[PDB]
Amino acid sequence: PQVQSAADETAVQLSELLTLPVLMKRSITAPLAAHI
Amino acid sequence: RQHTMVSFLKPVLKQIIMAGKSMQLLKNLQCAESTTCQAGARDAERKSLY
Amino acid sequence: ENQNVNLTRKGSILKNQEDTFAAELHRLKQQPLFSLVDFEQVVDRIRSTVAEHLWKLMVEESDLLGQLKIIKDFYLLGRGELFQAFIDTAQHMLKT
């Protein structure tokens, strides 16, 4: 979701709950770690 | 100076003083975390005396 | 975090409840007045959860009691008869 709709609000709920570095870490490393 | 009594509070000034002393004691007594800090009516949610 | 850097991927003590506390903090951010009581309550809940998981790991998973018993026996001379016999045997080496 992230930034891909308009009225949607959960798409940014993590972005308000989590900091951008921590959000990016959680979002990127989990699939990365799974594939590695 | 005896003049320091608040006339509007004067009828209740003694009770006020006793209550203030009691609250200062309770907050100043190392009370165990008393459950009577109910998470219910916050003092901020308590209507102020005003 | 420092232990999980070295420890295998054992999840957070609060695991999925971390986000719940994040939502509570977001509600606090949405609160028009800062209440120390609610903040302290949430902090204490998180603290208690983490402390309970740490205690469980230390006592059951990390056998804190065995280490304390070892320390008593050796550092605290808990095996007083053993350390007495050791002193009696090593005295000639350790008297110098």
Coordinates of all heavy atoms in Angstrom, one line a residue, chain C, unseen atoms left out:
Chain C
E1 N 18.2 -5.6 22.3 CA 18.8 -5.6 20.9 C 20.2 -6.1 20.9 O 20.6 -6.8 20.0 CB 18.7 -4.2 20.4
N2 N 21.0 -5.7 21.8 CA 22.4 -6.1 21.9 C 22.6 -7.6 22.0 O 23.4 -8.2 21.5 CB 23.2 -5.4 23.0
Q3 N 21.7 -8.2 22.8 CA 21.7 -9.6 23.0 C 21.2 -10.3 21.8 O 21.7 -11.3 21.3 CB 20.9 -10.1 24.2
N4 N 20.1 -9.8 21.2 CA 19.6 -10.4 20.0 C 20.5 -10.3 18.8 O 20.4 -11.0 17.8 CB 18.2 -9.8 19.6
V5 N 21.5 -9.3 18.9 CA 22.5 -9.2 17.9 C 23.4 -10.5 17.9 O 23.8 -11.1 16.9 CB 23.4 -8.0 18.1
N6 N 23.7 -11.0 19.1 CA 24.5 -12.2 19.3 C 23.6 -13.4 19.5 O 24.0 -14.5 19.0 CB 25.4 -12.1 20.5
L7 N 22.4 -13.3 20.1 CA 21.5 -14.4 20.3 C 20.7 -14.6 19.0 O 20.4 -13.7 18.2 CB 20.5 -14.1 21.4
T8 N 20.5 -15.9 18.7 CA 19.7 -16.3 17.6 C 18.3 -15.6 17.7 O 17.9 -15.2 18.7 CB 19.4 -17.8 17.6
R9 N 17.7 -15.5 16.5 CA 16.4 -14.7 16.3 C 15.3 -15.0 17.3 O 14.2 -15.4 16.9 CB 15.9 -14.8 14.9
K10 N 15.6 -15.0 18.6 CA 14.6 -14.9 19.6 C 13.8 -13.6 19.5 O 14.5 -12.5 19.6 CB 15.2 -15.1 21.0
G11 N 12.5 -13.6 19.3 CA 11.7 -12.4 19.2 C 11.8 -11.5 20.4 O 12.2 -11.9 21.5
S12 N 11.3 -10.3 20.2 CA 11.1 -9.4 21.3 C 10.3 -10.0 22.4 O 9.4 -10.9 22.2 CB 10.4 -8.1 20.8
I13 N 10.6 -9.6 23.7 CA 9.8 -10.1 24.8 C 8.4 -9.8 24.6 O 7.5 -10.6 24.9 CB 10.3 -9.4 26.1
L14 N 8.1 -8.6 24.1 CA 6.7 -8.2 23.8 C 6.2 -8.7 22.4 O 5.0 -8.7 22.2 CB 6.5 -6.7 23.8
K15 N 7.1 -9.2 21.6 CA 6.8 -9.7 20.2 C 5.8 -8.7 19.5 O 6.1 -7.6 19.3 CB 6.2 -11.1 20.3
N16 N 4.7 -9.3 19.2 CA 3.6 -8.5 18.4 C 3.0 -7.4 19.3 O 2.2 -6.6 18.8 CB 2.6 -9.4 17.9
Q17 N 3.2 -7.4 20.6 CA 2.6 -6.4 21.4 C 3.4 -5.1 21.4 O 2.9 -4.1 21.9 CB 2.5 -6.9 22.9
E18 N 4.6 -5.1 20.8 CA 5.3 -3.8 20.6 C 4.5 -2.9 19.8 O 4.4 -1.7 20.2 CB 6.7 -4.1 20.0
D19 N 3.9 -3.4 18.7 CA 3.1 -2.5 17.9 C 1.8 -2.0 18.6 O 1.3 -0.9 18.4 CB 2.7 -3.3 16.6
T20 N 1.3 -2.9 19.5 CA 0.2 -2.4 20.3 C 0.5 -1.2 21.2 O -0.2 -0.3 21.3 CB -0.3 -3.6 21.2
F21 N 1.7 -1.3 21.8 CA 2.2 -0.2 22.6 C 2.5 1.0 21.7 O 2.3 2.2 22.1 CB 3.4 -0.5 23.4
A22 N 2.9 0.8 20.5 CA 3.1 1.9 19.5 C 1.8 2.5 19.2 O 1.7 3.8 19.1 CB 3.7 1.3 18.2
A23 N 0.7 1.7 19.1 CA -0.6 2.3 18.8 C -1.1 3.1 20.0 O -1.7 4.2 19.9 CB -1.6 1.2 18.5
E24 N -0.8 2.6 21.2 CA -1.1 3.4 22.4 C -0.4 4.7 22.5 O -0.9 5.7 22.9 CB -0.8 2.5 23.7
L25 N 0.9 4.7 22.1 CA 1.7 5.9 22.1 C 1.2 6.8 21.0 O 1.2 8.1 21.2 CB 3.2 5.6 21.8
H26 N 0.7 6.3 19.9 CA 0.1 7.1 18.9 C -1.2 7.8 19.4 O -1.5 8.9 19.1 CB -0.2 6.3 17.6
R27 N -2.0 7.0 20.2 CA -3.2 7.6 20.8 C -2.8 8.7 21.8 O -3.4 9.8 21.9 CB -3.9 6.5 21.5
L28 N -1.7 8.5 22.5 CA -1.1 9.5 23.4 C -0.7 10.8 22.6 O -1.0 11.9 23.0 CB 0.0 9.0 24.2
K29 N -0.1 10.6 21.4 CA 0.2 11.7 20.6 C -1.1 12.4 20.1 O -1.1 13.6 19.9 CB 1.0 11.2 19.4
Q30 N -2.1 11.6 19.9 CA -3.4 12.2 19.5 C -4.1 12.8 20.7 O -5.1 13.5 20.5 CB -4.3 11.1 18.9
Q31 N -3.7 12.5 21.9 CA -4.3 13.0 23.1 C -4.0 14.5 23.1 O -2.9 15.0 23.0 CB -3.8 12.4 24.4
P32 N -5.0 15.4 23.4 CA -4.7 16.8 23.4 C -3.9 17.3 24.6 O -3.3 18.3 24.6 CB -6.2 17.5 23.4
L33 N -4.0 16.5 25.7 CA -3.2 16.8 26.9 C -2.3 15.6 27.2 O -2.7 14.5 27.1 CB -4.1 17.1 28.1
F34 N -1.0 16.0 27.5 CA -0.1 15.0 28.0 C -0.4 14.5 29.4 O -0.4 15.3 30.3 CB 1.4 15.5 27.9
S35 N -0.8 13.2 29.5 CA -1.0 12.6 30.8 C 0.2 11.8 31.2 O 0.5 10.8 30.5 CB -2.3 11.8 30.9
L36 N 0.9 12.2 32.3 CA 2.0 11.3 32.8 C 1.5 10.0 33.3 O 2.2 9.0 33.2 CB 2.7 12.1 33.9
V37 N 0.3 9.9 33.8 CA -0.3 8.7 34.3 C -0.4 7.6 33.2 O 0.1 6.5 33.4 CB -1.6 8.9 35.0
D38 N -1.0 8.0 32.1 CA -1.2 7.0 31.0 C 0.2 6.6 30.4 O 0.4 5.4 30.1 CB -2.1 7.6 29.9
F39 N 1.1 7.5 30.2 CA 2.4 7.2 29.7 C 3.1 6.3 30.7 O 3.7 5.3 30.2 CB 3.2 8.5 29.5
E40 N 3.1 6.6 31.9 CA 3.8 5.7 32.9 C 3.1 4.3 33.0 O 3.8 3.3 33.1 CB 3.7 6.4 34.3
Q41 N 1.8 4.3 32.8 CA 1.1 3.0 32.8 C 1.6 2.1 31.6 O 1.9 0.9 31.8 CB -0.4 3.2 32.8
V42 N 1.6 2.7 30.4 CA 2.1 2.0 29.3 C 3.5 1.6 29.4 O 3.9 0.4 29.1 CB 1.9 2.8 28.0
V43 N 4.4 2.5 29.9 CA 5.8 2.2 30.1 C 5.9 1.0 31.1 O 6.7 0.1 30.9 CB 6.5 3.4 30.6
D44 N 5.1 1.0 32.2 CA 5.2 0.0 33.2 C 4.7 -1.3 32.6 O 5.3 -2.4 33.0 CB 4.4 0.4 34.4
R45 N 3.7 -1.3 31.8 CA 3.2 -2.6 31.2 C 4.3 -3.2 30.3 O 4.6 -4.4 30.4 CB 2.0 -2.3 30.4
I46 N 5.0 -2.3 29.5 CA 6.1 -2.8 28.6 C 7.2 -3.3 29.5 O 7.8 -4.4 29.2 CB 6.5 -1.7 27.6
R47 N 7.6 -2.6 30.5 CA 8.7 -2.9 31.4 C 8.4 -4.3 32.0 O 9.2 -5.1 32.1 CB 8.9 -1.9 32.4
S48 N 7.2 -4.4 32.6 CA 6.8 -5.7 33.2 C 6.9 -6.9 32.3 O 7.4 -7.9 32.6 CB 5.4 -5.6 33.8
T49 N 6.4 -6.7 31.0 CA 6.4 -7.8 30.1 C 7.9 -8.2 29.8 O 8.2 -9.3 29.8 CB 5.7 -7.4 28.8
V50 N 8.7 -7.2 29.5 CA 10.1 -7.4 29.2 C 10.8 -8.1 30.4 O 11.6 -9.0 30.2 CB 10.8 -6.1 28.8
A51 N 10.6 -7.6 31.6 CA 11.2 -8.1 32.8 C 10.8 -9.5 33.1 O 11.6 -10.3 33.5 CB 10.9 -7.2 34.0
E52 N 9.5 -9.8 32.8 CA 9.1 -11.2 33.1 C 9.7 -12.1 32.0 O 10.1 -13.2 32.4 CB 7.5 -11.3 33.0
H53 N 9.8 -11.7 30.8 CA 10.4 -12.6 29.8 C 11.9 -12.8 30.1 O 12.4 -13.9 29.9 CB 10.2 -12.0 28.4
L54 N 12.5 -11.7 30.5 CA 14.0 -11.8 30.9 C 14.2 -12.7 32.0 O 15.1 -13.5 32.1 CB 14.5 -10.4 31.1
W55 N 13.3 -12.6 33.1 CA 13.4 -13.5 34.2 C 13.2 -14.9 33.8 O 14.0 -15.8 34.2 CB 12.4 -13.1 35.3
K56 N 12.2 -15.2 33.0 CA 12.0 -16.5 32.5 C 13.2 -17.1 31.8 O 13.7 -18.2 32.0 CB 10.7 -16.6 31.6
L57 N 13.8 -16.2 30.9 CA 14.9 -16.7 30.1 C 16.1 -16.9 31.0 O 16.8 -17.9 30.9 CB 15.3 -15.6 29.1
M58 N 16.3 -16.1 32.0 CA 17.5 -16.2 32.9 C 17.4 -17.4 33.8 O 18.3 -18.1 34.0 CB 17.6 -14.9 33.7
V59 N 16.2 -17.6 34.4 CA 16.1 -18.7 35.4 C 15.8 -20.0 34.7 O 16.5 -21.0 35.0 CB 14.9 -18.4 36.4
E60 N 14.9 -20.1 33.8 CA 14.7 -21.4 33.1 C 15.6 -21.6 31.9 O 16.2 -22.7 31.8 CB 13.2 -21.5 32.6
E61 N 15.7 -20.6 31.0 CA 16.5 -20.8 29.8 C 18.0 -20.7 30.1 O 18.8 -21.4 29.5 CB 16.1 -19.8 28.8
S62 N 18.4 -19.8 31.0 CA 19.8 -19.5 31.2 C 20.4 -20.1 32.5 O 21.5 -19.9 32.8 CB 20.1 -18.0 31.2
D63 N 19.5 -20.8 33.3 CA 19.9 -21.4 34.5 C 20.8 -20.5 35.4 O 21.9 -20.8 35.7 CB 20.7 -22.8 34.2
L64 N 20.2 -19.4 35.8 CA 20.9 -18.5 36.7 C 21.3 -19.1 38.0 O 22.3 -18.8 38.6 CB 20.0 -17.2 37.0
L65 N 20.5 -20.1 38.5 CA 20.7 -20.7 39.8 C 22.0 -21.5 39.7 O 22.8 -21.5 40.7 CB 19.5 -21.6 40.2
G66 N 22.3 -22.2 38.6 CA 23.5 -23.0 38.5 C 24.7 -22.1 38.6 O 25.7 -22.4 39.3
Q67 N 24.7 -21.0 37.9 CA 25.8 -20.0 38.0 C 26.0 -19.4 39.4 O 27.1 -19.3 39.8 CB 25.6 -18.9 36.9
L68 N 24.9 -19.1 40.0 CA 25.0 -18.6 41.4 C 25.5 -19.6 42.3 O 26.3 -19.3 43.2 CB 23.6 -18.1 41.9
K69 N 25.2 -20.9 42.1 CA 25.7 -22.0 43.0 C 27.2 -22.1 42.8 O 28.0 -22.3 43.7 CB 25.0 -23.3 42.7
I70 N 27.6 -22.1 41.5 CA 29.0 -22.2 41.2 C 29.8 -21.0 41.8 O 30.9 -21.2 42.4 CB 29.3 -22.2 39.6
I71 N 29.3 -19.8 41.7 CA 29.9 -18.6 42.3 C 30.0 -18.8 43.8 O 31.1 -18.4 44.4 CB 29.2 -17.3 41.9
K72 N 29.0 -19.2 44.4 CA 29.0 -19.5 45.9 C 30.1 -20.5 46.2 O 30.9 -20.3 47.1 CB 27.6 -19.9 46.4
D73 N 30.2 -21.6 45.5 CA 31.1 -22.6 45.8 C 32.5 -22.2 45.6 O 33.4 -22.5 46.4 CB 30.8 -23.9 45.0
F74 N 32.8 -21.4 44.6 CA 34.2 -21.0 44.2 C 34.5 -19.6 44.7 O 35.4 -19.4 45.5 CB 34.4 -21.1 42.7
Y75 N 33.7 -18.6 44.3 CA 34.0 -17.2 44.6 C 33.7 -17.0 46.1 O 34.4 -16.3 46.8 CB 33.2 -16.3 43.8
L76 N 32.6 -17.5 46.6 CA 32.2 -17.4 48.0 C 32.7 -18.5 48.9 O 32.3 -18.6 50.0 CB 30.7 -17.2 48.1
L77 N 33.5 -19.4 48.4 CA 34.0 -20.5 49.1 C 32.9 -21.4 49.7 O 33.0 -21.9 50.8 CB 35.0 -20.1 50.2
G78 N 31.8 -21.5 48.9 CA 30.7 -22.3 49.3 C 31.1 -23.8 49.6 O 30.6 -24.4 50.6
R79 N 32.0 -24.3 48.8 CA 32.6 -25.6 49.2 C 33.7 -25.4 50.1 O 34.9 -25.6 49.8 CB 33.0 -26.3 47.9
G80 N 33.4 -25.1 51.4 CA 34.4 -24.8 52.4 C 35.3 -26.0 52.7 O 36.5 -25.8 52.9
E81 N 34.7 -27.2 52.7 CA 35.6 -28.3 52.9 C 36.5 -28.6 51.7 O 37.6 -28.9 51.9 CB 34.7 -29.6 53.2
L82 N 35.9 -28.4 50.5 CA 36.8 -28.5 49.3 C 37.9 -27.5 49.3 O 39.0 -27.8 49.0 CB 35.9 -28.4 48.1
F83 N 37.5 -26.2 49.5 CA 38.5 -25.2 49.5 C 39.5 -25.3 50.7 O 40.7 -24.9 50.5 CB 37.9 -23.8 49.5
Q84 N 39.1 -25.9 51.8 CA 40.0 -26.2 52.9 C 41.0 -27.3 52.5 O 42.2 -27.1 52.7 CB 39.2 -26.7 54.1
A85 N 40.5 -28.3 51.9 CA 41.4 -29.4 51.4 C 42.4 -28.8 50.3 O 43.5 -29.2 50.3 CB 40.6 -30.5 50.8
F86 N 41.8 -27.9 49.4 CA 42.7 -27.3 48.4 C 43.8 -26.5 49.0 O 44.9 -26.5 48.6 CB 41.8 -26.5 47.5
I87 N 43.4 -25.6 50.0 CA 44.4 -24.8 50.8 C 45.4 -25.7 51.4 O 46.6 -25.5 51.3 CB 43.7 -23.9 51.8
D88 N 45.0 -26.8 52.1 CA 45.9 -27.7 52.7 C 46.9 -28.4 51.8 O 48.0 -28.6 52.1 CB 45.1 -28.8 53.5
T89 N 46.4 -28.6 50.5 CA 47.3 -29.3 49.6 C 48.2 -28.3 48.9 O 49.4 -28.6 48.7 CB 46.5 -30.0 48.5
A90 N 47.7 -27.1 48.6 CA 48.4 -26.1 47.8 C 49.3 -25.2 48.7 O 50.0 -24.3 48.1 CB 47.5 -25.3 47.0
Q91 N 49.2 -25.3 50.0 CA 49.8 -24.4 50.9 C 51.3 -24.2 50.6 O 51.8 -23.1 50.6 CB 49.7 -24.8 52.4
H92 N 52.0 -25.3 50.2 CA 53.4 -25.2 50.0 C 53.7 -24.3 48.7 O 54.7 -23.6 48.6 CB 54.0 -26.6 49.8
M93 N 52.8 -24.4 47.7 CA 53.0 -23.6 46.5 C 52.6 -22.1 46.8 O 53.2 -21.2 46.3 CB 52.2 -24.2 45.4
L94 N 51.5 -22.0 47.6 CA 50.9 -20.6 47.8 C 51.5 -19.9 49.0 O 51.2 -18.8 49.2 CB 49.4 -20.8 47.9
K95 N 52.3 -20.6 49.8 CA 52.9 -19.9 51.0 C 54.0 -19.0 50.5 O 54.3 -18.0 51.2 CB 53.5 -20.9 52.0
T96 N 54.6 -19.2 49.3 CA 55.6 -18.4 48.8 C 55.0 -17.2 48.0 O 53.9 -17.3 47.6 CB 56.5 -19.2 47.9

